[PDB]
């Protein structure tokens, strides 16, 4: 009857990602469901280092470009229908919500 449902959230903005995580956890505490999380995976830092100059003249200066990806994992012990209702709420821009049934 009760199943462990895993919700994964990814985003480039920390505040938006944290805001959605609080809403889901707070939205599940209202239904008195068991909640495990949020679990914060290590931040993925995509890095691109490139020559600033469009040509090869001058001092060799480099720009270090970073694109940080923050990942959150939330586990809810409830039926898929209840989880669907909680996650149906509008999500902040840039936050990707992925709901899957944990294989255990």
């Amino acid at each position: 009857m009760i199943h462990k449902i895993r919700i994964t959230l990814s985003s480039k903005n920390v505040k938006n990602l944290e805001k959605v995580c609080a809403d889901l956890v707070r939205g599940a505490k209202d239904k008195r469901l068991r909640v495990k999380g949020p679990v914060r995976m290590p931040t993925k830092v995509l890095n691109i280092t490139t020559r600033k100059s469009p040509c090869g003249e001058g001092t060799n200066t480099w720009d270090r470009f970073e694109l940080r990806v923050h990942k959150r994992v939330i586990d809810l012990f409830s039926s898929p229908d209840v989880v669907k209702q909680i996650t149906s709420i509008t999500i902040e821009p840039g936050v990707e919500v992925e709901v899957t049934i944990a294989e255990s």
């Binding site: 480039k12 995509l46 691109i48 490139t50 020559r51 600033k52 469009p54 720009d63 270090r64 470009f65 970073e66 694109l67």
Partner: peptide
């Protein structure tokens, strides 16, 4: 620049780096 599948030349990427989402820290 083939990293992450960008498939952009170094000049074009720097021009579009901010729009793609890359930032300098």
């Amino acid at each position: 620049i083939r990293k992450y599948g960008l498939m952009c030349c170094r000049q074009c990427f720097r021009s579009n780096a901010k729009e793609i989402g890359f930032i300098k820290y």
